């Protein structure tokens, strides 16, 4: 079993098509997910050509290790590829129709920047290396390019399945590489850390603000310290769901910005404490007033600027 | 080997049933459950009639490579269904009868809106692709589905497990497909969420309570605080249990709902030493008074209404 | 390859011996357990049989393919059983020792009712199907059923490795079945329970208690809602090691009956507070003068209580 | 293929040799370690004798499946069969050498009484049954036994790797075994322990025994139970780093006996306070100046006791 | 198929290279690193030479098993190398071109001292052992090792993939071995190390120094042990995402020394209350008044101390 050869010079197309069965497992931290699908190969082999009417069939079946098959592989796949072939069909012309059940756990960076607000597009590149005898390039039959309607992806809403029609030519190690490029257009369902995380984190942070209708320190000291606690409690939560990134995430800033303001309520109720044992409740009245105000203000306008810088 | 021919343009019946022997690992957060089952397969090929009264033998044995045998895959799995024939039996009709050992880890979706008192439905969908001679359908043979009676699923009460009769036939990629739904019915044990969350969550709530009977600044703030992080700590437990949903469940809308009690907790304690400090204990005594009737008299109703909306 | 046939009528008696390697990771929160075992079989195949002094020898090595092996199957095993032939051997008369090394993950249900005092029966199931031609029924051979010395489980004790001789017999999908149960009695090692876990539980609750010594409302809030904290940190902790069961185990049963022990604290230290806000601490001393007899008192009773109805 | 002829009643002598080329994860709750190494196994097959000068080739080289090889088997261990022949060396006598590459997951128990400062002895047990036809005995040839210089094990200083040359023969199931035992000296590294887990939880304690030069109730409740809590966070940190044993550990009773020290700290807290309360503060001075020296010299007392009892 | 004979008493060079398609899963407390890459192996086989004119094609294409392929395999991998071949290419001077297609789990150690500001050099070994007829040495071809420019490790900058050029040639059980050492040169992304683990460590460490601002010891108390108790936290975070090293990190150290500043911070917070009590708030005044300077100036001083020692 060897390449099918050139009429002419010209190089050997594979028509792709991915068809996504299921999605599962995009795991954050690791920049994975699972993949449950079919893929179709389709090619001309002259070599394979018989007359419709001397054979009796407008249609031949074969076995993988009978005909000459295109290593089409997968470039980003964690754990080696397992796939079992479900039809091969030979059309009169010496067309063949490849199609094969496949799974794997696809790697694909993504981008954290906007989360959990942000949304991310998956790649799956499909890869053939050209041989001694020709070129193959490969091509996409977008009638075969899809994913079915039941498909969902646990925490995610699927927008859209297309591939890049044209595929990447370039050279490894002295020879001609084809490369495509399918992509899984996704969005993450944030309603969860709504109700779960930034709420939560909002009232520990107003709570700690009541220091500033208070007068004791004790008190302060406790209602401070406390829901920083808490604040790191969910600072730690958060960041074990990510992967550690050489930029800020969106809640990476909001959650660092927090604590900011912890510190300068521990700078304030330490200042009005300093000041009334002092003898001066006049200076520290003045500045536990303003603070009242300014906190909310600041915090609030501190956000604006964020949502800007980020979105 | 290759399809038998129909006799007339009739599509191939394959007769299917599924026989459950174990029942393990339902995982809430991936939406999967593993299955230790019987698949049955049954379909009629002339090719290997023969007649009774001669034949000496009324049942003949082939080994699955001998003989021709229907594809017969699973859409919603995730780890290669291992399978391991046991028997295969022709009547002298004709009639094949499979018999496979079947285990594979299983992804449907799950409903999460009533946790932890939800009932769920699994499924099971077996599939099967046409070929180029014949069309195949299949049909469930209802003497052959169950399962045993030692299957237990950990933690989950099993109702019942049923097939959805009627194939859903539908043609993907230029090819007719035939679907079968089997349904396997469960609803989840919640015994132990009442001693182990849901109680513990309640006597925090109502220890946080007796600051309405206490007129000690430094004290409320520190039952009031110390709760409500105790509160954080089952909020957090519980959101591990349960994957991340773009609806509120019901154990997560009581948890959130906590929240806003603790906050209104907080300002109470604030107003009622903000009024103690400013002279005018006569107001502050009004509003703890109201304060003792008023939470446990809204918590109750929010509550109700609550399972009224979810249940 | 075919069943041997039948003198008579009569079923074919395939005898099993299961010899235990090693056992180990025996995982509470999925109910399996690990094993590395032989398992041999021995029946009558009268097609092999042979003249002890023609033949020239007396024993008759074999490769599993080349002759009929009963297919036995272990009915509860998750993990997909391997099994290496390491001897297949043939008596003159024909009788056939096989010997094969196994290794499974064995899933068997475990009562949690007595934890963590309680002892577990863990069961291996060997299941044989009955063919066309004849009928199959599984005995145990005494003499091949054990345990090597140095064989431990991890945390327990194992009692006895004993298997049921009298085989099950009953009709599934219209065939005969022989299922087997070969038992493990194991009794859990407690030990480390007593100074990890109630030790320092009940530690924290003799703390909590030392506030009826005390008329400090600021020093009772903090004895009591501190080790409260401590109290759930152990719960926790106890539930993570445990699966979700819909009845109450016996460390279950004494922790949530601790959380009523903290409540009535709670109650009582606000209660003695605010009498003595109220000038009355002449009716607080005698509350919390009770207290200190009666806390002790009832826990121990109620203890006590309970050790009976789980004992 | 069977085995060699006993040119006389003797039995047949493997001789096997082990080299690690890799060592890693020691599993310390699973009590298993992952070993990659060479197989090296050496016999005389006379049937495979050869002339060089008629055969043209001073020594022969063959694949598995066309000569006889000893089922040597590991005992413990879940690996499952992993490996791949790297040689078969025959030279004209008939000796063979065989050359394998393997790596499993042995299961070996560890000895925790003296954590972190103990030492274990890793086991590696070779097997052979012997057949039929002649018995099989192992050997050990000691050039053929070693470990390569960069092998190391995280968290461990490989002391030696030395095989026991006397095998165990013994009777299992009517059949010779030949047992070997490899070992694998190793002692923990214990210096992490000091600044992460040893130190914080001294420097706690210590901070708990400044309440005996405070006469502040309210400031001794916050500090010993507090520390009391940091204690507990230890205690469970360190038991989740090992198994359940039914004896008591090193550390397990130096955290265990700090309970004892917590809880006798604040009996002597409340009872300073209770006497306090009481205007007899001169009986509290003389307990709470006795408690300065004696916590100390008793902590240390009891500390040199248990360094005795355990080393 | 047997090695190829030298013309003269040479050894037979094998002419490696790796190329790199995917880094990814740098594991640190394991320390392995999983890498998806094109081996390619080069030889020259006389046997396997012909006529370029005579022949009629320039380059023949084998399979596998019908040629002699030289037995190279990875030194310090964990899973099972996963090869498939992609090519075999033969020159009509008798050279062969072999690429195969592997991904593996790579053991290397890692260096933790400098730690989070390490950089490391991950190593990939290739090894062949000589057989009886010739001896095997490797080789690097330049050419033929590289890394796609895609290539990205999550949480690391990837520096440089080169191969150490000189085999490491030694003598291994009476056969010559051929080692190359290619390696990935890495260095560690540190940037989410500062907002998470860095800042707010040293926030809740200034937190506990507002104590020398305050006379209260009950609320100095609150103060000190509150952020101790957020510093073990942190402490503990941190030392599970590392092994246990017999030396210590740098992160280590700072950790280590921040201990020390808050025990101190606690004796001091007593002396001060100490002398308060006993009527001479004076001397408390002074020292409290030095602690204000000496507690910053000493961790400045002391931190670039640290920084020295480790950088
Ligand atoms: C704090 C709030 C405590 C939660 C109380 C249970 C909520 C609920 O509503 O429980 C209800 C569910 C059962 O509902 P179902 O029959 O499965 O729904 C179908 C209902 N239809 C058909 C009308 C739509 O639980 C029970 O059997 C009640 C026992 C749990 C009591 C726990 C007390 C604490
Ligand atoms: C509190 C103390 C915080 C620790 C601060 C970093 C310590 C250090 O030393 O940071 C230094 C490292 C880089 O070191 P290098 O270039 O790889 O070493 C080369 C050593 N030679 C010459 C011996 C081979 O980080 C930086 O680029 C500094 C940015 C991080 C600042 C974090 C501030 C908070
Ligand atoms: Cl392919
Ligand atoms: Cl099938
Ligand atoms: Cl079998
Ligand atoms: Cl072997
Ligand atoms: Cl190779
Ligand atoms: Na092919
Ligand atoms: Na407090
Ligand atoms: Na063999
Ligand atoms: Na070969």
């Not at 954050?28 to 018989?50: G, H, I």
């Not at 007359?51 to 076995?63: A, C, F, I, L, Q």
């Not at 925490?155 to 590489?177: C, H, M, Q, Y």
């Not at 990134?245 to 910005?257: D, E, K, Q, R």
């Amino acid at each position: 079993v060897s390449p099918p050869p050139p009429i002419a010079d010209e190089p050997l197309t594979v028509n792709t098509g991915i068809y996504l069965i299921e999605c599962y497992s995009l795991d954050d931290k690791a920049e994975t997910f699972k993949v449950n699908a079919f893929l179709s190969l389709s090619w001309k082999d002259r070599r394979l050509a018989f007359d419709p009417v001397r054979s009796g069939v407008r249609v031949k079946t074969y076995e993988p290790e009978a005909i000459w098959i295109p290593e089409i592989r997968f470039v980003n796949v964690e754990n080696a590829r397992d796939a079992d072939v479900v039809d091969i069909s030979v059309s009169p012309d010496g067309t063949v129709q490849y199609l094969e059940r496949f799974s794997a756990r696809v790697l694909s960076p993504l981008d954290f920047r906007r989360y959990p607000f942000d949304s991310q597009t998956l790649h799956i590149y499909l890869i053939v290396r050209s041989v001694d005898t020709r070129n193959i390039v490969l091509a996409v039959d977008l009638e075969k390019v899809g994913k079915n309607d039941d498909v969902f992806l646990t925490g995610w809403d699927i927008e859209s399945f297309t591939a890049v029609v044209k595929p990447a030519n370039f050279a490894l190690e002295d020879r001609l590489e084809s490369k495509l490029d399918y992509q899984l257009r996704i969005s993450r369902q944030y309603f969860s850390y709504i109700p779960n995380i930034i709420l939560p984190m909002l009232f520990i942070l107003f709570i700690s603000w009541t220091a500033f209708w208070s007068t004791s320190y004790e008190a302060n000291v406790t209602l401070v310290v406390s829901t920083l606690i808490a604040h790191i409690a969910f600072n730690i939560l958060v960041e074990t769901n990510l992967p550690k990134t050489p930029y800020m995430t969106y809640t990476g800033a909001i959650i660092f910005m927090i604590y900011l303001f912890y510190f300068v309520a521990v700078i304030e109720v330490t200042v009005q404490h300093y000041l009334k044992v002092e003898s001066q409740p006049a200076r520290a009245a003045s500045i536990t007033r303003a603070s009242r105000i300014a906190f909310p203000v600041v915090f609030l306008l501190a956000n604006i600027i964020l949502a800007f810088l980020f979105f």
